[PDB]
Design a protein around this ligand. Structure first.
Ligand SMILES: Cc1[nH]c2c(N3CCCCC3)c(-c3ccccc3)nn2c(=O)c1-c1ccc(O)cc1
Ligand SMILES: Cc1[nH]c2c(N3CCCCC3)c(-c3ccccc3)nn2c(=O)c1-c1ccc(O)cc1
Ligand SMILES: C[S@@+](CC[C@H](N)C(=O)[O-])C[C@H]1O[C@@H](n2cnc3c(N)ncnc32)[C@H](O)[C@@H]1O
Ligand SMILES: C[S@@+](CC[C@H](N)C(=O)[O-])C[C@H]1O[C@@H](n2cnc3c(N)ncnc32)[C@H](O)[C@@H]1O
Lengths: 382, 382
């Protein structure tokens, strides 16, 4: 017990109503980028019973069929029948989209060289990396995401046909201190809540969630007789998706990042093109942090950057190594300065941020998966 | 420079479109609570040009005039004419509100003793306190909020009649390490962006923002010849409010809390009654953290708690004192156990969370202001 502590993170499934909105917002972004790599996109999505509303600002040369893009995203998630609470074929899709404000456009990107475009807004952003997993992510959030992915897998393969797309999971891990780094010891508590059909009973669900979901995801070495399980703790979850709870874009920002570890500056990712530093600078900050850890300079590290609207270079850059670096904080900042250029008009080139890959980022976290450009460490010169 | 670092936080004004939504959601909550202290409220607000949409779930004995509640909140904020981009008298108010899901109700509160109500959702929440200011908040966020409040003051008193309600500010402070605590040294950079009328010029605005806003808020001892000012950095901000940028409830969660310090579990506060632990447990965690600091046990402290839907007691409670306590982490946890009961049905009594004071929390941060119950430290027994 000496030197140990508990930490909890959560994740949600593809049909969680907030995550539906993130995925739709990024499907819209991708559709624009497929035709206009320089589309300016700020697409919020709102979901409630029978309704997807798109609201925001897009200036783009693309011709996008919003009805088709939205409905295909909902179909992919799995909401295809009134019996499940939501159906892509028959829901309302409402659009309240205007051009980007000309005042923003003139102050950010109009008549600017691409590398010297200003940040699309002010704000602060953080990147984090931890050596506790190979992918440099906290175990709590990785396991929580993988539990949701397993539910979707067993729904889609017909193993557990009573499952529906809306789910939430939560994992509490006991950690040991290790010279500023952290070492996972065991799983203390798991929560799983998932929408289900009217016919399956709680005992069938709880047994399946333990044997076919948890045991198929969480290594047995982390589970013991004392692990606490809260499986379908509400007792009934037939109503779900947007019918059970309104969804909005950008309401799962901690799920999207580090599960509470590190820090967060408040900005949402989905529905935004590269000029919105909330996304591009957070991706670049992750890339920096992961590069420092994979480069052997830190075991655990947090990077902050901040911007002013219309100004290309960050206003501030800061680093905290948790006592896990032999280099000083000053030396780390110099290494980052010499190896990275965090202007948005340079990040876009380094991370290929005009490519329409964003819908793939919008469930199961933006980091630690799939070797996206910000997950491929840069070789550092020093 | 040795032992120092930079940190940035931001805040937004009452007419920032996300903050409009938070305030409307809490005006709706308050209106329900005035008539039904036990109202179940989950009210999201969305704002775009000419539109306020309410979406979510409310079960309540109250009879609420949503048109009146929404329009009065917008009037208070100051959007009262088409020349400002938005007018409470003439905007569209659309309502997509349903009852709370019966499946949630049965699993959370139906036929439960109030003290033993379950958490209204799973999730994780943090509370933070720092002795660097008397109110136990980070200086970066306090100053950022006060800059926005000063803008609203000079708008309302007619000093600077070209101001409009939508604003954002951002403050970067140089800090010194102090045995795990932090000591503010100076202000490194200030950003202010505020919506303005068509007639005032940039030089008049920038001079006023420096002399009448910054100097009226930030002590001169923090400002020097090297401080960087980004005042109206976009160059033009005539279009603003929802017309310039869509607003949604729960998109300023870092502004609402600690400006990036501490940690955040991802849950939004506004529009939610006490059974939604995203709000009540975050408020209680702040109360715990502030009580530990004001009790002289810590100089700086972070508390995590987590819940499962339908379960009253937290699943986990954890504490980090940043090396600023003479008591061990184990001893602090025992003190918290002996002095606090973090079931939502007890928090509601301790913090008086049926009282309709929530609209007042929804701008300028939920913490560090106005001696709300969670800001009054508990005298600890140990
Ligand atoms: C003991 C400890 N606790 C701790 C905490 N806690 C965990 C429980 C809830 C509150 C925050 C966080 C944290 C987690 C997330 C966000 C922000 C801060 N970091 N962190 C540590 O680094 C250490 C530590 C590690 C290695 C070492 O050698 C000495 C100390
Ligand atoms: C030097 C240092 N830096 C630091 C950081 N940084 C700041 C810049 C950007 C990245 C995070 C944070 C932090 C801030 C917000 C969220 C999460 C973590 N905490 N923190 C520290 O506690 C210390 C420290 C203080 C006293 C001491 O005696 C020794 C060290
Ligand atoms: C519990 S609902 C949030 C509170 C809700 N807005 C209300 O009106 O009380 C939040 C999320 O939990 C999940 N959820 C919905 N219904 C649920 C149920 N009956 N049991 C468990 N989780 C549920 C869904 O993922 C949903 O998006
Ligand atoms: C810059 S807008 C976000 C990006 C925007 N959605 C777009 O379409 O590019 C975000 C916030 O910045 C502020 N803002 C809006 N127009 C602005 C302008 N012309 N100059 C500076 N800040 C502005 C408002 O507070 C607004 O809510």
């Amino acid at each position: 017990e000496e030197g140990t502590f508990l930490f909890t993170s959560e994740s949600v499934g593809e049909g969680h109503p907030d995550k539906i909105c993130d995925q739709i917002s990024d499907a819209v972004l991708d559709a624009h980028l497929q035709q206009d790599p320089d589309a300016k996109v700020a697409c919020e999505t709102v979901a409630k019973t029978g309704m997807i509303l798109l609201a925001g600002e897009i200036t783009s040369r693309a011709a996008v069929d919003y009805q088709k893009v939205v409905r295909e995203a909902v179909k992919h998630i799995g909401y295809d029948d009134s019996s499940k609470g939501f159906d892509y074929k028959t829901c309302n899709v409402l659009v309240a989209l205007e051009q980007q404000s000309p005042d923003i456009a003139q102050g950010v990107h109009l008549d600017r060289n691409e590398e010297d475009i200003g940040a699309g807004d002010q704000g602060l952003m953080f990147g984090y990396a931890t050596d506790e997993t190979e992918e440099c992510m906290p175990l709590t959030i990785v396991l929580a995401h993988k539990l949701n992915a397993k539910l979707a897998e067993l729904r889609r393969n017909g193993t557990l046909p009573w499952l529906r797309p809306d789910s939430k999971t939560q994992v509490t891990v006991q950690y040991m201190q290790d010279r500023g780094a952290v070492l996972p010891i065991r799983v203390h508590t798991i929560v799983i809540s998932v929408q289900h059909d009217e016919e399956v009973c709680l005992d069938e669900m709880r047994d399946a969630l333990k044997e076919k979901v948890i045991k198929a995801v969480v290594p047995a070495k982390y589970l013991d007789e004392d692990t606490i399980y809260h499986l379908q703790p509400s007792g009934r979850f037939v109503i779900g998706g947007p019918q059970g709870d309104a969804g909005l874009t950008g309401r799962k920002i901690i799920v999207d990042t580090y599960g509470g570890w590190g820090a967060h500056g408040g900005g949402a990712f989905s529905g935004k093109d590269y000029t919105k530093v909330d996304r591009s600078a957070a991706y670049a900050a992750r890339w920096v942090a992961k590069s420092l850890v994979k480069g052997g300079l830190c075991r655990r590290v947090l990077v902050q950057v901040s911007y002013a609207i219309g100004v290309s270079h960050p206003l501030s850059i800061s680093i905290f190594h948790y006592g896990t670096s032999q280099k000083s904080e000053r030396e780390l900042l110099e290494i980052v300065k010499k190896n990275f250029d965090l202007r948005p008009g340079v990040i876009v080139r380094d991370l290929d941020l005009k490519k329409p890959i964003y819908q793939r980022t919008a469930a199961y976290g933006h980091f630690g998966r799939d070797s996206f450009p910000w997950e491929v460490p840069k070789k550092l010169k020093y």
